[PDB]
Each structure stands twice: as C-alpha cells, then as structure tokens.
Coordinates of C-alpha atoms and ligand atoms in Angstrom, one line a residue:
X1 CA 0.0 0.0 0.0
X2 CA 0.9 3.7 -0.3
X3 CA 3.2 5.2 2.4
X4 CA 1.8 7.2 5.3
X5 CA 3.2 10.2 7.1
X6 CA 1.7 11.3 10.6
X7 CA -1.6 9.6 9.7
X8 CA -1.7 11.1 6.2
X9 CA -1.4 8.9 3.1
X10 CA 1.0 10.2 0.4
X11 CA -0.1 8.2 -2.8
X12 CA 3.0 9.2 -4.8
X13 CA 4.5 5.9 -5.7
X14 CA 6.3 4.2 -7.4
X15 CA 8.4 7.2 -8.4
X16 CA 8.8 8.8 -5.0
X17 CA 9.6 6.6 -2.0
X18 CA 11.0 6.7 1.6
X19 CA 8.9 9.6 2.8
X20 CA 9.5 11.7 5.8
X21 CA 7.7 14.5 7.5
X22 CA 8.8 18.1 7.2
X23 CA 6.0 20.6 7.9
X24 CA 2.4 21.5 7.6
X25 CA -0.2 24.1 6.7
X26 CA -4.0 24.6 6.9
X27 CA -4.9 22.2 4.1
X28 CA -1.5 20.9 3.2
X29 CA 1.3 18.7 4.4
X30 CA 4.9 18.7 3.3
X31 CA 7.2 15.6 3.2
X32 CA 10.6 14.8 1.8
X33 CA 10.8 11.9 -0.6
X34 CA 13.4 10.0 -2.8
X35 CA 12.8 10.5 -6.6
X36 CA 13.8 7.2 -8.2
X37 CA 13.8 8.8 -11.7
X38 CA 16.0 11.8 -10.9
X39 CA 18.0 10.1 -8.1
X40 CA 17.5 13.1 -5.6
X41 CA 15.4 13.7 -2.6
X42 CA 12.6 16.3 -3.2
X43 CA 9.9 17.9 -1.2
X44 CA 6.3 16.9 -1.9
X45 CA 3.3 18.9 -0.7
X46 CA -0.1 17.1 -0.5
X47 CA -3.0 19.6 -0.9
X48 CA -6.6 18.5 -0.1
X49 CA -8.7 21.5 -1.1
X50 CA -11.7 20.2 -3.1
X51 CA -14.3 20.2 -0.3
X52 CA -14.1 24.0 0.1
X53 CA -14.5 26.8 -2.5
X54 CA -11.9 29.1 -0.9
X55 CA -9.2 26.3 -0.7
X56 CA -9.8 25.5 -4.4
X57 CA -9.3 29.2 -5.5
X58 CA -6.1 29.4 -3.6
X59 CA -4.9 26.0 -4.9
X60 CA -5.5 27.2 -8.4
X61 CA -3.8 30.6 -8.0
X62 CA -0.7 29.1 -6.4
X63 CA -0.4 26.5 -9.1
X64 CA -0.9 28.9 -12.0
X65 CA 1.4 31.5 -10.5
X66 CA 4.3 29.1 -9.5
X67 CA 4.1 27.3 -12.8
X68 CA 4.5 30.7 -14.6
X69 CA 7.3 32.0 -12.2
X70 CA 10.8 31.2 -12.7
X71 CA 13.5 32.8 -10.4
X72 CA 16.4 31.7 -8.2
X73 CA 14.6 33.1 -5.0
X74 CA 11.2 31.6 -5.5
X75 CA 10.2 27.9 -5.0
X76 CA 9.2 26.2 -8.3
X77 CA 7.0 23.3 -9.2
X78 CA 9.0 20.3 -10.6
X79 CA 6.1 17.9 -10.9
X80 CA 2.4 17.5 -10.0
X81 CA 0.9 14.1 -9.1
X82 CA -2.9 13.6 -9.2
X83 CA -5.3 10.9 -10.4
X84 CA -5.8 9.9 -14.0
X85 CA -9.6 10.7 -13.8
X86 CA -11.3 13.8 -12.1
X87 CA -13.4 11.4 -9.9
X88 CA -10.4 9.6 -8.4
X89 CA -8.6 13.0 -7.8
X90 CA -9.0 14.0 -4.1
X91 CA -5.5 15.1 -3.5
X92 CA -2.9 17.0 -5.3
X93 CA 0.7 16.5 -4.8
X94 CA 3.1 19.3 -5.7
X95 CA 6.8 18.3 -6.1
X96 CA 9.5 20.9 -5.4
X97 CA 13.2 21.2 -4.7
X98 CA 13.9 20.2 -1.2
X99 CA 15.4 22.8 1.0
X100 CA 17.0 22.2 4.4
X101 CA 15.1 24.4 6.7
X102 CA 13.2 27.7 6.9
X103 CA 14.0 30.9 8.7
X104 CA 11.4 30.3 11.5
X105 CA 13.3 27.1 12.6
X106 CA 16.7 28.8 12.0
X107 CA 15.9 31.7 14.3
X108 CA 15.0 29.3 17.2
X109 CA 18.6 27.9 17.0
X110 CA 20.8 30.8 16.3
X111 CA 21.3 34.6 16.4
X112 CA 22.2 35.8 12.9
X113 CA 25.3 37.8 12.0
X114 CA 24.8 41.2 10.4
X115 CA 26.4 39.7 7.3
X116 CA 23.8 36.9 7.2
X117 CA 21.0 39.3 8.1
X118 CA 22.0 41.6 5.1
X119 CA 22.3 38.7 2.6
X120 CA 19.0 37.0 3.6
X121 CA 17.3 40.4 3.4
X122 CA 18.7 41.0 -0.1
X123 CA 17.5 37.6 -1.3
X124 CA 14.0 38.2 0.2
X125 CA 13.8 41.5 -1.8
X126 CA 15.3 40.2 -4.9
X127 CA 12.6 37.5 -5.0
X128 CA 10.0 40.1 -4.2
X129 CA 11.2 42.4 -6.9
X130 CA 10.4 39.6 -9.3
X131 CA 7.0 38.8 -7.9
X132 CA 6.0 42.5 -7.8
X133 CA 7.3 43.1 -11.2
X134 CA 4.7 40.6 -12.4
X135 CA 2.1 42.6 -10.5
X136 CA 1.6 39.7 -8.1
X137 CA 1.5 39.9 -4.3
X138 CA 2.6 37.1 -1.9
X139 CA 0.5 38.3 1.0
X140 CA 1.8 35.9 3.6
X141 CA 5.5 36.6 4.0
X142 CA 6.8 35.4 7.3
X143 CA 9.9 33.4 8.5
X144 CA 8.4 29.9 8.0
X145 CA 7.7 30.8 4.3
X146 CA 11.4 31.5 3.6
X147 CA 13.3 28.3 2.8
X148 CA 17.0 28.0 3.5
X149 CA 19.9 25.6 3.0
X150 CA 23.3 25.5 4.8
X151 CA 24.9 27.7 2.1
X152 CA 22.4 30.5 2.8
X153 CA 20.4 30.3 -0.4
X154 CA 17.0 31.6 0.2
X155 CA 13.6 30.7 -1.6
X156 CA 10.2 32.2 -1.0
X157 CA 7.5 29.5 -0.8
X158 CA 3.8 29.0 0.2
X159 CA 1.9 31.2 -2.3
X160 CA -1.4 30.0 -1.1
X161 CA -2.6 33.7 -0.4
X162 CA -1.0 35.2 -3.4
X163 CA -3.0 37.5 -5.8
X164 CA -2.7 39.9 -8.7
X165 CA -2.4 43.3 -7.3
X166 CA -5.7 45.3 -7.4
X167 CA -5.3 48.8 -5.9
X168 CA -8.7 50.0 -7.1
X169 CA -10.4 47.4 -5.1
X170 CA -8.2 47.6 -1.9
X171 CA -10.6 49.6 0.2
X172 CA -12.7 47.9 2.8
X173 CA -14.3 48.6 6.2
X174 CA -13.0 48.6 9.8
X175 CA -12.3 45.3 11.5
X176 CA -12.8 43.0 8.4
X177 CA -11.5 39.4 8.5
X178 CA -8.1 38.6 7.1
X179 CA -6.4 35.3 6.6
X180 CA -2.7 36.1 6.4
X181 CA -0.6 35.5 9.6
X182 CA -1.5 38.0 12.4
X183 CA 1.8 39.1 13.4
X184 CA 2.9 40.2 9.9
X185 CA -0.1 42.3 9.0
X186 CA 0.2 45.8 8.1
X187 CA -1.8 48.3 10.3
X188 CA -4.1 49.2 7.5
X189 CA -5.4 45.7 7.3
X190 CA -7.3 46.3 10.5
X191 CA -8.5 49.8 9.4
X192 CA -9.4 49.9 5.7
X193 CA -7.4 47.5 3.5
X194 CA -8.0 44.1 1.8
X195 CA -4.2 43.6 1.3
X196 CA -4.4 44.1 -2.5
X197 CA -1.4 46.4 -2.9
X198 CA 2.3 45.8 -3.0
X199 CA 2.8 47.8 0.3
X200 CA 1.2 44.9 2.1
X201 CA 4.3 42.8 1.3
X202 CA 6.8 45.4 2.2
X203 CA 5.4 45.7 5.7
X204 CA 5.8 41.9 6.2
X205 CA 9.4 42.2 5.1
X206 CA 10.0 44.9 7.6
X207 CA 8.7 42.6 10.3
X208 CA 10.9 39.8 9.1
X209 CA 13.9 42.1 9.2
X210 CA 13.1 43.1 12.8
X211 CA 13.0 39.4 13.7
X212 CA 16.3 38.6 12.1
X213 CA 17.9 41.5 14.1
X214 CA 16.5 40.4 17.5
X215 CA 14.9 36.7 17.4
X216 CA 11.8 38.4 18.6
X217 CA 8.6 39.1 16.6
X218 CA 8.3 42.9 16.7
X219 CA 4.5 43.0 16.9
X220 CA 3.2 39.8 18.7
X221 CA -0.4 40.7 18.9
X222 CA -2.6 38.4 21.1
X223 CA -5.7 38.9 18.9
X224 CA -6.9 40.6 15.8
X225 CA -7.3 44.1 17.1
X226 CA -4.4 43.9 19.7
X227 CA -2.2 43.5 16.7
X228 CA -2.8 47.1 15.8
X229 CA -2.2 48.3 19.3
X230 CA 1.2 46.6 19.2
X231 CA 2.1 48.3 16.0
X232 CA 1.2 51.8 17.5
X233 CA 3.2 50.7 20.6
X234 CA 6.3 51.3 18.5
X235 CA 5.3 53.7 15.8
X236 CA 3.4 55.9 18.2
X237 CA 0.2 57.6 17.5
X238 CA -0.2 58.4 13.8
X239 CA 0.2 62.0 12.7
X240 CA -2.7 64.2 11.6
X241 CA -1.5 63.8 7.9
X242 CA -1.7 60.0 8.3
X243 CA -5.0 60.2 10.2
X244 CA -6.4 62.1 7.4
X245 CA -5.8 59.2 4.8
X246 CA -8.2 57.0 6.9
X247 CA -11.6 58.0 5.6
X248 CA -13.6 55.1 7.2
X249 CA -15.3 56.8 10.1
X250 CA -15.4 53.7 12.3
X251 CA -11.6 53.2 11.8
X252 CA -10.8 57.0 12.3
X253 CA -12.9 57.1 15.5
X254 CA -11.2 54.1 16.8
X255 CA -7.8 55.7 16.4
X256 CA -9.0 58.9 18.1
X257 CA -10.3 56.9 20.9
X258 CA -6.8 55.5 21.9
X259 CA -4.5 57.4 24.4
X260 CA -1.5 59.0 23.0
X261 CA 1.5 56.7 22.3
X262 CA 5.0 57.7 21.9
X263 CA 7.3 56.6 19.0
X264 CA 9.8 54.2 20.4
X265 CA 13.3 54.7 18.9
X266 CA 14.5 51.8 16.8
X267 CA 17.8 51.7 18.6
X268 CA 16.2 50.9 21.9
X269 CA 14.7 47.6 20.4
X270 CA 17.9 47.0 18.3
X271 CA 20.8 48.3 20.3
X272 CA 23.5 46.2 18.4
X273 CA 22.1 46.6 14.8
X274 CA 23.7 48.3 11.9
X275 CA 22.3 51.8 11.8
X276 CA 21.6 51.6 8.1
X277 CA 19.5 48.4 8.7
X278 CA 17.4 50.5 11.2
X279 CA 17.0 53.3 8.7
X280 CA 15.7 50.8 6.1
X281 CA 13.6 49.2 8.8
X282 CA 12.1 52.7 9.5
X283 CA 11.1 53.1 5.9
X284 CA 9.6 49.6 5.6
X285 CA 7.4 49.9 8.8
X286 CA 5.7 53.2 7.9
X287 CA 2.3 53.6 9.0
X288 CA 1.0 55.3 5.9
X289 CA 1.1 52.7 3.1
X290 CA 1.4 55.4 0.5
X291 CA 4.7 56.6 2.1
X292 CA 6.1 53.0 2.7
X293 CA 9.2 52.2 0.7
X294 CA 8.8 50.2 -2.6
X295 CA 10.8 47.1 -3.4
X296 CA 13.3 48.6 -5.8
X297 CA 13.9 51.5 -3.4
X298 CA 14.5 49.1 -0.7
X299 CA 17.1 47.2 -2.7
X300 CA 18.7 50.6 -3.6
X301 CA 19.0 51.5 0.1
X302 CA 22.6 51.9 1.5
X303 CA 22.2 48.9 3.9
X304 CA 22.1 46.6 0.8
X305 CA 24.9 48.4 -1.1
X306 CA 27.3 45.5 -1.3
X307 CA 24.5 43.4 -3.0
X308 CA 22.2 45.6 -5.1
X309 CA 23.0 45.2 -8.8
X310 CA 20.1 45.5 -11.2
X311 CA 22.0 43.6 -13.8
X312 CA 21.7 40.4 -11.7
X313 CA 18.1 40.8 -10.7
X314 CA 15.6 39.3 -13.2
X315 CA 12.1 40.8 -13.6
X316 CA 9.1 39.2 -15.1
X317 CA 8.3 39.5 -18.8
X318 CA 4.9 41.1 -18.3
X319 CA 2.2 41.4 -15.6
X320 CA 0.6 38.1 -14.6
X321 CA -3.1 37.8 -15.6
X322 CA -5.8 35.3 -14.6
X323 CA -8.1 34.6 -17.4
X324 CA -11.3 34.5 -15.4
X325 CA -12.4 35.6 -12.1
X326 CA -11.9 32.8 -9.6
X327 CA -14.0 34.3 -6.7
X328 CA -17.3 33.3 -8.2
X329 CA -16.7 29.9 -9.6
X330 CA -18.0 26.9 -7.4
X331 CA -15.6 24.3 -6.3
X332 CA -16.7 21.8 -8.8
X333 CA -15.9 24.4 -11.6
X334 CA -12.6 25.1 -9.8
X335 CA -11.8 21.4 -9.6
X336 CA -12.1 21.0 -13.3
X337 CA -9.6 23.9 -13.8
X338 CA -7.2 22.4 -11.4
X339 CA -7.5 19.1 -13.3
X340 CA -6.8 20.8 -16.6
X341 CA -3.8 22.8 -15.1
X342 CA -2.2 19.7 -13.9
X343 CA -2.7 17.6 -17.2
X344 CA 0.7 18.4 -18.7
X345 CA 2.3 16.4 -15.9
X346 CA 0.4 13.2 -16.2
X347 CA 1.8 10.3 -17.9
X348 CA 1.0 10.3 -21.5
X349 CA 0.4 13.9 -22.8
Ligands
5ID1 N1 10.7 22.6 -0.6 C1 10.6 22.6 0.8 N2 11.8 22.1 1.4 C2 11.8 22.2 2.7 N3 10.8 22.6 3.6 C3 9.7 22.9 3.0 C4 9.6 23.1 1.5 C5 8.2 23.5 1.4 I1 7.2 23.9 -0.4 C6 7.7 23.7 2.5 N4 8.5 23.4 3.6 C7 8.4 23.4 5.0 O1 7.0 23.1 5.2 C8 6.2 24.2 5.9 C9 4.9 24.3 5.3 O2 4.8 24.7 4.0 C10 7.2 25.4 5.5 O3 7.0 26.4 6.6 C11 8.6 24.8 5.6 O4 9.1 24.6 6.9
CL2 CL1 -9.7 41.2 18.8

C-alpha cells in the first residue's frame, strides 16, 4: 500500500519513496521523498482542497502562479501528481526542490550575524522584486515561508494567499476578517485594506527584518485588534496627515479613541544593529502605506549596497493575468480547472 506520514497517506509511488515529515499548513502537509527517476530527494506537498471553494481558489492561484514564475529566490514546481480521472482525484501533490530548513526554525537555534541578515534580506527583496514586477502579491511573507539551506540560499514559498495586485479594490471597512498570519499584518489591514497592494508585502518584510535583528517578533499581537495596538506601541500615534488618509469613520474614530502613544526609537529595540539596517527598517514599517518604501527603493538603500545590482536581478516579462475571475466559480468548476492545469504532468500527454 501507499506510504503514510503522521496519519496522512501520500499516494506518490512508485516514483517517490521513503517519505519523511517536514511541515504542515491549513490544508497541506509537506514531506521529503526520494525520486527514483532523478535520483534526488525532493519535497512533496499534499493539498486537499476540493471540499471548500476558498481552498480551491487558492490552490488554483498558487499552481498557476508558480508554474508561470521562474526565479532563483522563488520555489518552483517540478512535478504535479494527481489521479488519472477527475473522480479519483481527491488530493494534489506538488513536487518541489527540497530545502534544508526555513527561517522560523533557524531563528529558534541561532542569532544571525549582520552579514547573514544583510544577505538574507537581499534575497527576500530580490525574489520580491520579481514577484512585484509581475504585478503579483505574496500576502503571507513570514519566517516560515522563507526556505534556506546551509549555504544561505533563500527561496520564498507558500503562495497560497498570493493574488494579482488590485489597488482599485483595496478599500474595505473597519475590522474586516483577514487570513494572512496575524503578526505580519500591516496596520491598514485592521483599518481599511484588503491587502491588494504591493505595500502589504513590504510591511511583512520589515517585520521579518526586525525578527532577524533580534529573534523576537516585533509586533506579537494576542488577537486581531491587539495587533494594531502593538504596532502603535512602537510607531506611536499616527500623525494628523496619516490620520487624514483614513476616511472610514469607524476606523478613524477608533484611532482617535486611543490614548496618545510615543514613538519608540529603533535603537532601543535593536541596540546592536547596523544603523543603516534600522534606517531601512524605519522606511519599511511606515504607518501610511502610500509613504512606505517600494521594493526597488529598498534594494537601492545603503544597507544593501554591497549586493544591489540590477544587472543580476531578473524581472518578469509582463504582468501576470488570470483569465477568469476565480472568486465566483463553484468548487466543482474550480476542480475541473485544477484538473486541466495539472494535465501536462500526467503520464502520456
Ligand atoms: N521545498 C521545501 N523544502 C523544505 N521545507 C519545505 C519545503 C516546502 I514547499 C515547505 N517546507 C516546510 O513546510 C512548511 C509548510 O509549507 C514550511 O514552513 C517549511 O518549513
Ligand atoms: Cl480582537
């Protein structure tokens, strides 16, 4: 029978054998496996989305985006295993290059040198530059979605929440639900934003930089709204100019109800950090998303001067485009699209 990892069956034989657990997500599990064809150990992610429409949308978007993308700092799809007929297909296995660890695991074991912080940050932004050049957003950047090896190569993974940027439809009401990981949410998520602009990813990168500098999450909110209070606990109360960009009266009245909070200087939090790193951090963790630094500007910052080189930083050929609007289609419709997108990998074809 097929192999089984922590109660989950990975029906990936006979090509991929000798499976071993690596990690897990909301509707996914990741193992390592030996590819008998290529004679290398790979990573395989089992995804089981078909009972829920939202999980099918995200599965389709991640597959279509990662099959289109090709970049050294972004995880790629080597192979997709599913059933020969649409009725036997209940799981999708995505085969990827195996990496050794992720940054979340690494930060539990070690304090990074400034040299390693700088190089990791460079690679995050180099990958992000490519993603944003395609008009795509990752929307869930965090240490556990940054894969590493012992030679300090970095790859961004887990594009389940990725979308094409859509600034015209970014506005939403106060206290709306959000799926991306709480500690890395920009303040506007809780006030007026759906996370449909590039500035959402820059904030998360700033949070990651803070964590590399200190091995502490900078904004560890205990609950949805407490997250915003922690952000203001460092940035201080927003200025009148920034207050005036929030039109939502419920959001604006909430901010005006808070006591005044002082801005906490970065070097109190990070007393041993490179001062150029803290200047870049300041520009990434700007309250106002319209004043927040953009990805190319971040790469061009003095902190990254020893690495920034546009002649060695690929961009996408053109903006990514979804043919049809995925938010409406029922999960049975979405399941057919996923079946079609995976046909090229099936034996035959
Ligand atoms: N290719 C890979 N190589 C090594 N580990 C991997 C991957 C992939 I895809 C994911 N992971 C690990 O599993 C967690 C859930 O995606 C991630 O947070 C991460 O720890
Ligand atoms: Cl709350």
